[PDB]
């Protein structure tokens, strides 16, 4: 069924591809994911808009809005993408998670470091357990009878 994708392909510009754009106001730029050819300009002609991406948001968590019924359809047509694009789509579950830099087999020291961090989090939990039994908003110390408030978050 390659006949159905003929129009999409452009001889002058090139084959279709998926990338991002840079638009908005100076100082508050936001990424916009669209579909275009290879030689097309970064900000110009576009075939279809897939979504957007906001790496900086007031809440502090990166947002990502995408179309689940369009990305899968475009991939079947034979549309490539950059390395960075694959990583973001992998987390969403649309495509297999690509390997990180230097591969996975070399990730030897990180495995041990991650275990230490996980162990510390579990140990910290045990510490706070006892606190709830004798929670004291106001706790002094044997220095100058100074007041020290305690609050969780």
């Amino acid at each position: 069924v390659r006949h159905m994708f003929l129009p999409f392909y452009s001889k002058e510009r090139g084959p279709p591809r998926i990338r991002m754009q840079v638009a908005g106001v100076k100082g508050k730029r936001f990424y916009k994911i669209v579909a275009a050819n290879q030689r097309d300009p970064r900000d110009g002609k576009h075939m279809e808009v897939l979504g957007s991406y906001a790496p900086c948001t007031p809440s502090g968590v990166e947002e990502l809005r995408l179309r689940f019924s369009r990305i899968k359809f475009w991939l079947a047509a034979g549309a490539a993408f950059n390395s960075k694009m694959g990583g973001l789509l992998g987390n969403a579950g649309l495509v297999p998670l690509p390997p990180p830099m230097f591969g996975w087999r070399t990730k030897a020291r990180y495995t041990l470091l991650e275990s230490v961090m996980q162990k510390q989090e579990k140990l910290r939990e045990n510490q706070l357990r006892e606190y709830f039994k004798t929670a004291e908003p106001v706790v002094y110390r044997q220095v100058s009878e100074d007041r020290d408030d305690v609050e969780q978050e």
Partner: protein
Amino acid sequence: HFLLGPAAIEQQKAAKMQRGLTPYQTELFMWERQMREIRKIYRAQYLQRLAEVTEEERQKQLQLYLQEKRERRLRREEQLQRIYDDKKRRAVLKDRMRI
């Protein structure tokens, strides 16, 4: 469930290396082969679902075409009857005046 499941991650690591290639290349090529299978799965699914919609739309066109054909045929026939009835009266009346 295999490509998108945890089994895909461990599959890339368990691969045979080749002389003259970096460790990252072995996993990259293995991942590329997996990406080729997902494209076919989506293509097959889209075509199968599109076929159902195409057949449903075809039935609507046939029903609409038949309904419009009957409406025009009946309306046209009624108009012709009025003209034919009136034309006959004029022809016979005109000959009467000549005599």
